[PDB]
């Protein structure tokens, strides 16, 4: 829909919020990725006055500036095009709208869960007209191995090492679930050359950027040879992928599993954790969407039980033809 490349090993970001632990986790990731510099240029915190914070670049202690006014951070760090918003739900709308007044920001991550859908609809409309990519709300974010990870995504160094998240493979994924995104990190690393980029779009009814938004970016990314989608019950988003393939827009292999098949076996409605998990028509069920995907040429497993098994199968057939 909008840009194709959001992050690189030179991406510099501003962090709205006093989330020291998440910033340090990002820095640890930057280090073992052999980045030249930290990915967090400055933090914003309107509660306290301008100051600087102790952080650790490897074993060496460094400092990152913390500004009270967003206007001062954007001005003193014009290299920033990404903002990771850790604001509480009550203030996430205002701070996000304020961010999109700085045309330097091309990608915003909204962590907070609980933002009224009517408000997020208003955020989407502003970003749509300004070409800003919103990842969220209600997401941990995403990770681009070797280059950039959003806040807590990917966890601590030991997980970044175990899942080989310090260098890219050829497999891009997009999920609604933040926790399952780190499971996809684990599964993909164990069955392929590893993750090239992963995005968690969040569990809300209207995510800032949809599944197809990122699947499209992946179709336009040469280093990406195959795509995994952990879809979900609710809405009709995954149907855009059936369309994309039908129109010749989606050519690379696509693996997809939609979670929420149990809801077809419940005698009445059950709302799941993700605010957008509700199936309002028959076509929004996980079973109905999995079936439509398989008929459109998507590689759909029988169950999540066998998701890693089908990912490995697609990968090896791609290695066979010398695509990887």
């Amino acid at each position: 829909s909008k840009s194709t490349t959001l992050f690189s090993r030179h991406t510099k970001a501003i962090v709205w919020g006093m989330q020291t632990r998440a910033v340090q986790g990002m820095l640890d990731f930057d280090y073992v990725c052999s980045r030249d510099e930290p990915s967090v240029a400055a933090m914003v915190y309107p509660f306290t006055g301008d100051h600087k914070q102790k952080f650790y670049w490897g074993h060496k202690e460094i400092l990152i500036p913390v500004f009270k006014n967003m206007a001062d951070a954007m001005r003193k760090h014009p290299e920033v095009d990404v903002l990771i918003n850790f604001a509480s739900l009550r203030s996430a709308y205002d701070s996000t709208m304020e961010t999109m007044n700085y045309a330097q920001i091309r990608t915003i991550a909204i962590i907070a869960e609980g933002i009224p859908e009517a408000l997020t609809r208003k955020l989407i409309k502003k970003a749509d007209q300004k070409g800003v990519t919103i990842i969220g709300p209600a997401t941990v974010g995403g990770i681009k191995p070797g280059c950039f990870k959003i806040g807590n995504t990917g966890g601590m160094l030991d997980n970044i090492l175990a899942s080989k998240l310090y260098r890219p493979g050829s497999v891009a994924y997009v999920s609604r679930s933040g926790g399952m995104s780190n499971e996809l990190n684990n599964i993909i690393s164990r069955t392929t050359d590893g993750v090239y980029e992963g995005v968690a779009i969040g569990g809300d009814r209207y995510p800032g950027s949809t599944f197809m938004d990122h699947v499209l970016r992946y179709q336009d990314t040469p280093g990406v040879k195959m795509i995994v989608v952990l879809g979900e019950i609710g809405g009709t988003e995954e149907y855009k992928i059936c369309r994309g393939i039908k129109e010749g827009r989606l050519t690379k292999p696509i693996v997809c599993w939609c979670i929420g098949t149990c809801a077809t076996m419940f005698s009445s409605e059950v709302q799941f954790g993700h605010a957008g998990a509700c199936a309002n028509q028959a076509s929004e069920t996980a079973v109905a969407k999995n079936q439509a995907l398989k008929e459109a040429g998507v590689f759909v497993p029988r169950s999540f039980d066998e998701l890693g098994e089908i990912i490995q199968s697609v990968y090896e057939d791609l290695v066979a033809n010398g695509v990887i």
């Binding site: 609604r176 679930s177 399952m180 569990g203 929420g260 993700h274 996980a286």
Partner: peptide
Amino acid sequence: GGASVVYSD
């Protein structure tokens, strides 16, 4: 939120 659904599935 997602894993709890998968286990249920």
